[PDB]
Amino acid sequence: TPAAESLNARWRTAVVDGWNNAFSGRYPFKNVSSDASLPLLAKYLNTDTGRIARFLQNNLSGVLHREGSRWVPDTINTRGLTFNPAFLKAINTLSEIADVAFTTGNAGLHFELRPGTAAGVMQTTLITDNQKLIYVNQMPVWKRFTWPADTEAPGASLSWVSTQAGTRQYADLPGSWGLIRLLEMARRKAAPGVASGWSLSWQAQDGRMLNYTLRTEAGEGPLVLLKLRNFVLPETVFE
Amino acid sequence: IKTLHLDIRAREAINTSAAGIPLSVVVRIYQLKDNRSFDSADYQALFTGDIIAQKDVWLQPGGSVAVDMPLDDAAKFTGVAAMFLEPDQKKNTWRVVLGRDELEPDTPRLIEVSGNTLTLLPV
Ligand SMILES: [Zn+2]
Ligand SMILES: [Zn+2]
Ligand SMILES: [Zn+2]
Numbered sequence: 001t002p003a004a005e006s007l008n009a010r011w012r013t014a015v016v017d018g019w020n021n022a023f024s025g026r027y028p029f030k031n032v033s034s035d036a037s038l039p040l041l042a043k044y045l046n047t048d049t050g051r052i053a054r055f056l057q058n059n060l061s062g063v064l065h066r067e068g069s070r071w072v073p074d075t076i077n078t079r080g081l082t083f084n085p086a087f088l089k090a091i092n093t094l095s096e097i098a099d100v101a102f103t104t105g106n107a108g109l110h111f112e113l114r115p116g117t118a119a120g121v122m123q124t125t126l127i128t129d130n131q132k133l134i135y136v137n138q139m140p141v142w143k144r145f146t147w148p149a150d151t152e153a154p155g156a157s158l159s160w161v162s163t164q165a166g167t168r169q170y171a172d173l174p175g176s177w178g179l180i181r182l183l184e185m186a187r188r189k190a191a192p193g194v195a196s197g198w199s200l201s202w203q204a205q206d207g208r209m210l211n212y213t214l215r216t217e218a219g220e221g222p223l224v225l226l227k228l229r230n231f232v233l234p235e236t237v238f239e
Numbered sequence: 240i241k242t243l244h245l246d247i248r249a250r251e252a253i254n255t256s257a258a259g260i261p262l263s264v265v266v267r268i269y270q271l272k273d274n275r276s277f278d279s280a281d282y283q284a285l286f287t288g289d290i291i292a293q294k295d296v297w298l299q300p301g302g303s304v305a306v307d308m309p310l311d312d313a314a315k316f317t318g319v320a321a322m323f324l325e326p327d328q329k330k331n332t333w334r335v336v337l338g339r340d341e342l343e344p345d346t347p348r349l350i351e352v353s354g355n356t357l358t359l360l361p362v
Binding site: 121137138139140163 | 254256260261262263264265282283286297299322323324325326
């Protein structure tokens with residue numbers, strides 16, 4: 001453990017101290033107005049060149065192995081150290097996020113949305129980073145979206161038209177995390193007849209439902225960033 | 240004929256979803272030079288030089304909308320197509336075509352929306 005304890009100290013100096021300063025009290029870690037920097041998050045969780053991946057490659061190559069897009073401990077010749085279970089769980093969560101949202105070396109994923117219908121709804125208008133999907137109860141088509149998309153004013157919004165009232169705002173969420181903030185407000189359930197599908201439902205005013213089907217290109221797609229909610233990077237690698 | 244008179248009437252159960260819930264629907268009215276391009280085009284093509292004018296009306300369940308628009312001289316035909324959720328594409332009951340001869344000068348032609356169909360009520 002003297003070598004293991006000096007590695008725990010290297011882990012906090014090289015990774016955790018910086019991670020905490022950069023992301024504590026920011027969205028998606030906390031449900032607040034302040035936003036985590038997407039380019040800075042990429043610097044930490046890039047699969048190969050990220051600060052976390054570099055520390056694991058440089059300090060843990062022996063006892064910790066990459067198995068696809070996963071980090072797996074060595075069961076044979078543990079030096080004979082015991083990993084902090086919260087550390088393995090943390091790096092596995094981050095690897096899953098990186099695998100879905102940071103494959104290009106920067107933040108960026110694609111997903112599709114298919115608009116649904118509901119009683120009392122005439123129109124829905126979903127906008128994310130200047131990509132608009134307007135639906136008026138016609139034959140539903142899958143629309144492809146990018147997140148983050150290139151724009152000077154990032155954000156997401158959702159409005160709707162009622163049979164009784166006119167056009168109403170459901171929510172308007174500015175910033176680079178706009179889409180994630182919007183998705184967090186939806187009632188979500190894994191749709192087992194569509195791959196990789198989730199039914200999304202925003203509860204608008206007067207009991208009106210704003211329904212969509214989300215199809216991801218891999219895993220949970222943009223929903224994976226919700227795993228950062230209350231996420232804590234552990235202060236130790238080993239117990 | 241100078242003006243185009245159309246009345247679009249909807250029954251209580253129109254544009255029914257899977258759950259049998261009635262929904263409002265958008266009806267598009269086309270002022271065409273000929274009916275070949277319109278007829279040959281399917282739902283997908285139509286809703287993404289024959290087009291002189293285009294008009295969109297919103298039809299609420301159990302509702303009605305009156306179309307009174309200037310008939311432009313080149314308009315040999317009028318196309319009425321409804322942007323239904325699940326239209327019957329084999330039957331082609333989601334749209335109607337009417338030639339200028341089918342039009343009355345002061346009186347509107349009755350287009351009835353019921354379920355997933357548009358029916359032109361005989362004069
Ligand atoms: Zn090993
Ligand atoms: Zn893609
Ligand atoms: Zn007259």
